[PDB]
Amino acid sequence: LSTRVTLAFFMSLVAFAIMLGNALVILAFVVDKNLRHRSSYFFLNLAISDFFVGVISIPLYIPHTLFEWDFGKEICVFWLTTDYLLCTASVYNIVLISYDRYLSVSNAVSYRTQHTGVLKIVTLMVAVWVLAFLVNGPMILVSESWKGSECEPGFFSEWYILAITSFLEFVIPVILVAYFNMNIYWSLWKRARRLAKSLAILLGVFAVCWAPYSLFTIVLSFYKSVWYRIAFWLQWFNSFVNPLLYPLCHKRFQKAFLKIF
Amino acid sequence: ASIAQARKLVEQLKMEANIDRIKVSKAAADLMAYCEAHAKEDPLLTPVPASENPFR
Amino acid sequence: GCTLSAEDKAAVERSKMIEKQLQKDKQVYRRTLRLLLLGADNSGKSTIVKQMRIYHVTSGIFETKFQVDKVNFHMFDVGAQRDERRKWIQCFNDVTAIIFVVDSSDYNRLQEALNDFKSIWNNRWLRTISVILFLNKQDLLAEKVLAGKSKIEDYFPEFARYTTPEDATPEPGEDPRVTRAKYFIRKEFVDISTASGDGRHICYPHFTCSVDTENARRIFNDCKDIILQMNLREYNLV
Amino acid sequence: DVQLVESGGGLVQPGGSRKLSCSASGFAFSSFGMHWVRQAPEKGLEWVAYISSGSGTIYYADTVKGRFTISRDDPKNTLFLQMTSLRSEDTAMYYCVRSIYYYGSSPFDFWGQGTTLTVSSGGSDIVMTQATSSVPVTPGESVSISCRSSKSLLHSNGNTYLYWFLQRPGQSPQLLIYRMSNLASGVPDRFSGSGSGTAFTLTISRLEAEDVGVYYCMQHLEYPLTFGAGTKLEL
Amino acid sequence: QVQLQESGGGLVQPGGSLRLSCAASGFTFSNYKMNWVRQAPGKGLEWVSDISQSGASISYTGSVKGRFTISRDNAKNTLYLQMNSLKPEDTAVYYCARCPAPFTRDCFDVTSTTYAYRGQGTQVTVSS
Amino acid sequence: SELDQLRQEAEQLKNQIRDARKACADATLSQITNNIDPVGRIQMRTRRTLRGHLAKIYAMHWGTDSRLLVSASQDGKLIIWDSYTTNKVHAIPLRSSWVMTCAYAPSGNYVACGGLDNICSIYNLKTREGNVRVSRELAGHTGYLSCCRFLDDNQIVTSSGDTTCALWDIETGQQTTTFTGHTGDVMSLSLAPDTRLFVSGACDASAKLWDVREGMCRQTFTGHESDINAICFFPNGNAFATGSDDATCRLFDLRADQELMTYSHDNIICGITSVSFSKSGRLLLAGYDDFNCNVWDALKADRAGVLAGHDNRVSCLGVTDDGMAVATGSWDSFLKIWNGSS
Ligand SMILES: CC(C)CCC[C@@H](C)[C@H]1CC[C@H]2[C@@H]3CC=C4C[C@@H](O)CC[C@]4(C)[C@H]3CC[C@]12C
Ligand SMILES: CC(C)CCC[C@@H](C)[C@H]1CC[C@H]2[C@@H]3CC=C4C[C@@H](O)CC[C@]4(C)[C@H]3CC[C@]12C
Ligand SMILES: N=C(N)SCCc1cnc[nH]1
């Protein structure tokens, strides 16, 4: 079908854009060798999460929904685990970057002179990945053991589990990021349009991209369509917007991009 | 104390004014006769093959 | 691993053990903040460094180490060098800040200090280093302007057309003449500071007496602000 | 000046345990890898153990592996060898040896004094042969000592790893030549070393009366350092 | 090679006028900001006036502002100082100084003693 | 008076010297080198990068064996590198962290360093105790040390920012000879191949040729317009090259006693900080403050190549005695070895 072919082409182009942006971010990180600061490490972690999103989630999703080919049951479980792990890892990396900026602004002499860490960075990456998995993975496995025909987690029938998972994975990150950004803005104004606009945009992109799907699934669980699919895709679109917002707006990474290109 | 410095400068000028000088043609020809006589012994000019490079 | 002899591997091990100590030295290098002290014959910088190292514990460079709120400052004062600063001032292009001391009560040699400040501000290698400007001898200046034949108008003709602004905020008990002279002198340097700053460059002007205790806190706060703006610049915030 | 003093030797029954110590004074003990080398009562030198500069690399001879253990106390400048299950073949004199490794260093330069120990009642080794075990010499005449290994000692670095040592009667060995051609500090210019991969020669030109002793030939090409039989020069 | 030769300047009554000239050779006149400095009798070197490469930026020392004017001829390679309404404290040895490097705003060591790029000076005596 | 007459006599002597120099200018060097083949394009690729120092690398010096190298950085450290394997042979902390110069003894037993401390420190690399120990401190100059060059294990020439060079006796620590001709900070010095003469460039646009054995200036060369930061002898010892704040290098001859060629371009407006010749003496390697390095054809003055691999100003530049590699240091705490490709 022509319309199905065009739709698959557009989704493949979106996946290619995500993969390409994250590939340039990672390539700059490897090539420059001056991006060994903790901020560059966290930017690399975020880029890796978004790259794996673009390289695994969408390409496997192209046939399942457009050119019908039922992958199976175990493949559905693996796809769900990978997708949820990567999305939550990206969100937690965003939270960690916001916290690091809050540290850099709140205390400066300590963030420049006293603080030091090499094992801290690897432990933090492992911790954010572990929390990202532990939020959803085991519960998704239990839910898929519970179930039905549609490739879904299967826990959408019960609204308590959805409420708990969404509350943690969205409310805690959004509150923390808003708190950090508002602290930065208010403590820099107390001691400016561009700064406030940038912080508001950084918070708003995350909120707009991650709220509607969770709210819609909670509403449907407590008591598929044309709006549900858009809510599904916005979470993925955040994964394309993140490379240009967080890394490319940092001096070291943009200097590396200017030099390499 | 400018008298002493002036005397020293004048004496140095007399010392430098008694030097024999060759023509620029001869000096230029001599610098060439050195540059294109050790040309093959310059690894930074017509370099050596990769099997003879200490650095690689 | 392979193609390495028995001694060729112990050489690598020794090199790695050297890198270990280099990594340890990097930490102590990053912990301390390095400052460059500058002034003239009558600045009084010697008095401030003595009275600041005492209470806050022919060589070519003198070093002074002090500590405020558990942060370490290492300050360098030049000495036994000659009168041409073209080629040795390029060494201090990565210091945290340039402390610059000016004798305020000397009208004859105030344009000399202004020209020194201009040359320091506009230097290519000191083009991104902030300046902590101390204006010493406020007591001598006070007794000089309060009553005497010395007038700032004979050297700077625009003083007679200068009135202290509405937001003067003078110290209590100051004669309006003294405070007007003080902010005129400070503005004489702030004009140069703001004429070519264009970011990454801020002057911090202070009024210091002969023996003032709160001189380490002033430098500590100024360095706090300087490092904070470095952090803001690296994240494209401000 | 530089001094290494060994202690802890004595008489032990078979199957016992004994610890030897090497105390170093007069040099930076923490910058040198350290070796324990034992010489049988009359059967030449034999390498025992090696510990690195930062104690990160440790090697044992297969004869003593599993029984002996080499350790290092850097603040106290001491080197330890703990021997467990002493056989009757472990009776020997033990020496503690420095070795510093960088581009142009001189390993095995200074040897310890040695402590004696008496006990009452392999596949891939570079075998090195010193066929001439006795040479009669007179002062003023040149002498030549020959050495030969199994595997070639020339590496891709262009470096040939052969060491010539001299043990005088009643004295600890002394490094004469390192890497088959270089002359150790304090060695008179009479000594020379010349070899081609597998066959090596030590030449003494103006032989004096202080050069009588046993000459030993060692390879540092691989990990189990191997010594020669030892050529004896006597009047 | 580098030479800065000043001319003009002599005995003059108070309130008079003078024109100091400085002919430059050995370098490119158009790439260097140039200064007029002064040494009073028994006093240190003092910076009087400054003019940029093109001449858009002109600066004085304040104590002589409004009475002195510094001019720059890049084709004739000359530096001029017009001195009007002289005072008894304007008598001094005047030097024509060049900044050490081209294409720079800062000018280090201009008023130092034994400075390399400076003229021998012209004496001006404002005496009745 | 006496001073005026002395000044007029000095100007007369200047005119006489200028006329004598002009009389022997039969033809320019560029006319004589007008039919030889151009060198082409010297494309040099990076081979090794050495990443030990924590601050600005201010000086370096190759070893005479063409394999070891020394480097000083203003964190207060002096590192000896094995260039072939990028290993670190020695790492020496210094009492003063303001160091502007380096030296490597031709014997190889000693190193030297100095800076804003007005002291030249000599360190003994080959110690029986396994350390690197401060052999000597020479404390005569009243200005910062700009350069230093060994003659043998017991002799060294230093230049200071007080208009003075000095030949020392390392065993006694006393100035054997003093050279007091310059009127500005001496920035560099290069020893003649036979080490019987040397040259010094200073911050007065003049270079001077001194005789070490008798301690008097032989000739003075004044062609530049600003301070000279670098100097190096031609491989045959009968010429030298100078780099200055104006974006021009210049070639001077000791026999014709005048400047021979100028190396400059309109796009280059920064200052040169380091010069060197290749082994044959046909390539002039000039380091610039625009983070680059330029390979000039020393004959024909044509620009042959660019070495653009540094993220900050290039401060030090040296060439292997074999002529096989070029080591360039920079203010970004990195040092890079460059070699050609066949
Ligand atoms: C599918 C899930 C389990 C993936 C697991 C997380 C992966 C992507 C993370 C976790 C820890 C991370 C590593 C942590 C530290 C380093 C060292 C650094 O010098 C290069 C990157 C590297 C090597 C990271 C690569 C990415 C990494 C391996
Ligand atoms: C289900 C929820 C609770 C999972 C965790 C999400 C939030 C709370 C996580 C994600 C990233 C985390 C941060 C990552 C790194 C650091 C730095 C460390 O020195 C202190 C903890 C701190 C500041 C963590 C606090 C908790 C944190 C903000
Ligand atoms: N990619 C989609 N729109 S569905 C699952 C997304 C997700 C939600 N919490 C973790 N991951």
Q: Does C34 contact chain E (CB < 8 Å)?
A: no
D96 shares its domain with D147: no
Q: What are phi and psi of C215, to 5 degrees?
A: -100, -25
Domain that holds residue A148: 2-260
A240: its two tokens: 């394309």
Order of all β-strands in the sheet with E3-7: E3-7, E17-25, E78-84, E68-73
Query: Which of D110, D50, D119, D53 lies closest to D85 in space, CA to CA?
Result: D119
Amino acid type, F334: F
Query: Which of D231, D218, D213, D164 lies closest to D191 in space, CA to CA?
Result: D164
F208: its two tokens: 């001077």
Non-local (6+) Cβ contacts of F327 within 8 A are: F60, F62, F69, F83, F317, F318, F319, F320, F335, F336, F337, F338
Residue closest via CA to ligand 3's atom 2 equals A232
Please give the Cα distance from F75 to F91 (Å, whole number).
12
Are residues A25 and A247 in contact, defined by beta-carbon separation less than 8 angstroms? Answer: yes
Q: At which residue do the structure tokens 């700032």 appear?
A: C152
Residue closest via CA to ligand 3's atom 9 equals A84
Q: What are phi and psi of F170, to 5 degrees?
A: -65, -35
Please give the Cα distance from C165 to C146 (Å, whole number).
20
Under CATH, to which class is F2-340 assigned?
mainly beta
Provide the 10 A C-beta neighbour count for residue C173: 6
Mark whether A and B touch (3+ CB pairs within 8 Å).
Answer: no
D154 shares its domain with D173: yes
Are residues A253 and A42 in contact, defined by beta-carbon separation less than 8 angstroms? Answer: no
E33 vs B49, C87, C124, E98, CA distance in Å? 52, 19, 16, 7
Q: Do E100 and F205 touch (CB under 8 A)?
A: no
Residues in chain A, total: 261
Provide the 10 A C-beta neighbour count for residue F48: 20
Provide the 10 A C-beta neighbour count for residue A9: 11
Please give the Cα distance from D28 to F130 (Å, whole number).
6
Pairs across B and F, CB distance < 8 A: 169
Please give the Cα distance from F129 to C33 (Å, whole number).
36
A63: its two tokens: 């046939």
C225 to chain A: closest CA residue: A108
Are residues F149 and D23 in contact, defined by beta-carbon separation less than 8 angstroms? Answer: no
| Residue to mutate (ligand 2; options A131, A169, A183; most atoms within 8 A of CB) | A131
Q: Which of D92, D119, D146 is the last residue of a domain?
A: D119
Subunits next to D (3 or more Cβ pairs <8 Å) are C, F
Mark whether D and B touch (3+ CB pairs within 8 Å).
Answer: no
Residue C57, helix vs strand vs coil: coil
Residue D33, helix vs strand vs coil: strand
Query: Which of C124, C103, C121 lies closest to C112 in space, CA to CA?
Result: C103
Mutate to test the interface with A, among C26, C74, C229, C235 (most CBs of A within 10 A): C235
**Pocket of ligand 2 from Cβ distances under 6 Å:** A 92, 95-96, 99, 124, 128, 131, 135, 168, 172, 176
Query: Which of C194, C50, C69 lies closest to C133 in space, CA to CA?
Result: C194
D58 to chain C: closest CA residue: C10
C20 shares its domain with C80: no
B56 to chain F: closest CA residue: F47
Chain F partners of C25 at a C-beta cutoff of 8 Å?
54, 75, 77, 93
F72: its two tokens: 């000083």
Query: Which of F84, F89, F95 lies closest to F52 in space, CA to CA?
Result: F89
E112 to chain F: closest CA residue: F184
For every residue of D41-108, DSSP letters joined together read SSS-EEEEEEE-SSS--EEE-TTTTTTEEEEEETTTTEEEEEEES--TT--EEEEEEEE--STT--TT
Q: Which of F 276-315 lie inside 8 A of B, CB atoms?
A: 278-283, 298-299
Q: Is F273 left (phi over 0), alpha (psi -120 to 50) or beta?
A: alpha
Non-local (6+) Cβ contacts of F99 within 8 A are: F58, F59, F72, F73, F74, F76, F78, F113, F114, F115
Strand runs (DSSP E) across chain A, as ranges?
Answer: none
Q: What is the largest CA-CA distance in chain F?
A: 69
Query: Which of C237, C215, C227, C235 lies closest to C101 in space, CA to CA?
Result: C215
Please give the Cα distance from F187 to F205 (Å, whole number).
11
Order of all β-strands in the sheet with F197-202: F186-191, F197-202, F207-211, F217-221
Domain that holds residue B14: 3-55
Please give the Cα distance from C103 to C135 (Å, whole number).
6
Are residues F187 and F202 in contact, defined by beta-carbon separation less than 8 angstroms? Answer: yes
Query: Which of D87, C90, D233, C3 lies closest to F315 in space, CA to CA?
Result: C90
Chain D partners of C5 at a C-beta cutoff of 8 Å?
155, 157, 159, 161, 221
Residue closest via CA to ligand 1's atom 10 equals A126
CA of C139 to the centre of ligand 1 (A): 63
Please give the Cα distance from A200 to D154 (Å, whole number).
69
Q: At which residue do the structure tokens 């006149």 appear?
A: E29
**What sign does the dihedral F282-F288-F294-F296 (CA atoms) show?**
negative
For every residue of F168-191, DSSP letters joined together read EETTTTEEEEEE---SS-EEEEEE
CA of A196 to the centre of ligand 3 (A): 29
Domain assignment present for E126 = no
**What sign does the dihedral A55-A56-A58-A60 (CA atoms) show?**
positive
Are residues D86 and D92 in contact, defined by beta-carbon separation less than 8 angstroms? Answer: no
**Domains in chain D: how many in total?**
2
Please give the Cα distance from F279 to F199 (Å, whole number).
19
E114: its two tokens: 């034994």
C-alpha neighbours within 13 Å on the C-beta side of residue E118: 26
Q: Do D27 and F129 touch (CB under 8 A)?
A: yes
Residue F95, Cβ density class (10 Å: 0-12 exposed, 13-18 middle, ≥19 buried): exposed
Residue closest via CA to ligand 1's atom 3 equals A129
CATH number of residue D202's parent domain = 2.60.40.10
Resolution in A: 3.1
Please give the Cα distance from F70 to F60 (Å, whole number).
5
Residues in chain C, total: 238
Residues in chain B, total: 56
F215: its two tokens: 């301690």
C25 shares its domain with C116: no
Order of all β-strands in the sheet with D115-119: D11-12, D115-119, D92-99, D33-39, D45-51, D58-60
Q: Do C84 and F184 touch (CB under 8 A)?
A: yes
**Domains in chain A: how many in total?**
1
Mark whether E and F touch (3+ CB pairs within 8 Å).
Answer: yes
CATH number of residue A141's parent domain = 1.20.1070.10
Please give the Cα distance from F265 to F297 (Å, whole number).
13
Domain assignment present for E124 = no
Q: What are phi and psi of E43, to 5 degrees?
A: -150, 160
Please give the Cα distance from F149 to F102 (Å, whole number).
8
Please give the Cα distance from A179 to A177 (Å, whole number).
5
Domain that holds residue C10: 1-31
Q: Please state the separation of Cα C21 from the chain's center in Å.
A: 32
Are residues D200 and D217 in contact, defined by beta-carbon separation less than 8 angstroms? Answer: yes
Please give the Cα distance from A41 to A125 (Å, whole number).
9
**What sign does the dihedral C30-C32-C33-C35 (CA atoms) show?**
negative
Give the closest-approach CA distance of F223 to chain E in angstroms.
7
Q: At which residue do the structure tokens 């962290």 appear?
A: F97
Residue D26, Cβ density class (10 Å: 0-12 exposed, 13-18 middle, ≥19 buried): middle
Query: Which of D106, D111, D110 lies closest to D184 in space, CA to CA?
Result: D106
Q: What are phi and psi of F309, to 5 degrees?
A: -145, 5
Please give the Cα distance from C147 to C177 (Å, whole number).
10
Question: CA end-to-end span of chain D, whole Å?
Answer: 32
Residue closest via CA to ligand 1's atom 16 equals A122
Provide the 10 A C-beta neighbour count for residue F186: 29
CATH number of residue B41's parent domain = 4.10.260.10
Non-local (6+) Cβ contacts of A22 within 8 A are: A47, A48, A50, A51, A54, A243
Nearest CB neighbour to C87, from listed F55, F93, F203: F203
Q: Does A145 contact chain C (CB < 8 Å)?
A: no
Please give the Cα distance from C193 to E24 (Å, whole number).
33
| Residue to mutate (ligand 3; options A235, A238, A240, A242; most atoms within 8 A of CB) | A235
Chain C partners of A252 at a C-beta cutoff of 8 Å?
234
Chain E partners of F271 at a C-beta cutoff of 8 Å?
101
Specify the experimental method: cryo-EM
Residue F173, Cβ density class (10 Å: 0-12 exposed, 13-18 middle, ≥19 buried): middle
**Domains in chain C: how many in total?**
2
D196 shares its domain with D169: yes
Are residues F271 and E101 in contact, defined by beta-carbon separation less than 8 angstroms? Answer: yes
CA angle E27–F244–E37, rounded 5-degree value: 50
Amino acid type, A100: D
For every residue of A88-103, DSSP letters joined together read HHHHHHHHHHHHHHHH
β-partners of residue F148 are F158
D36 vs A254, C10, D162, CA distance in Å? 56, 17, 19
Report DSSP state, residue D149. Answer: -
Residue F77, helix vs strand vs coil: strand
For every residue of F87-121, DSSP letters joined together read EEEEEEE-S-S-EEEEEE-SSSSEEEEEETTS-EE
Residue closest via CA to ligand 1's atom 26 equals A45
Q: At which residue do the structure tokens 């074999």 appear?
A: F322
Whether the CB of A210 sits within 6 Å of ligand 3: no
**Domains in chain B: how many in total?**
1
Alpha helices in chain C (DSSP H): 6-31, 45-55, 110-122, 138-146, 176-195, 216-234
CATH number of residue E71's parent domain = 2.60.40.10
Residue closest via CA to ligand 3's atom 5 equals A84
Domain that holds residue D144: 128-233
Ligand nearest to the CA of A124: 2
Order of all β-strands in the sheet with F99-104: F99-104, F110-115, F120-124, F133-138
Query: Which of A36, A42, A171 lies closest to A101 in space, CA to CA?
Result: A42
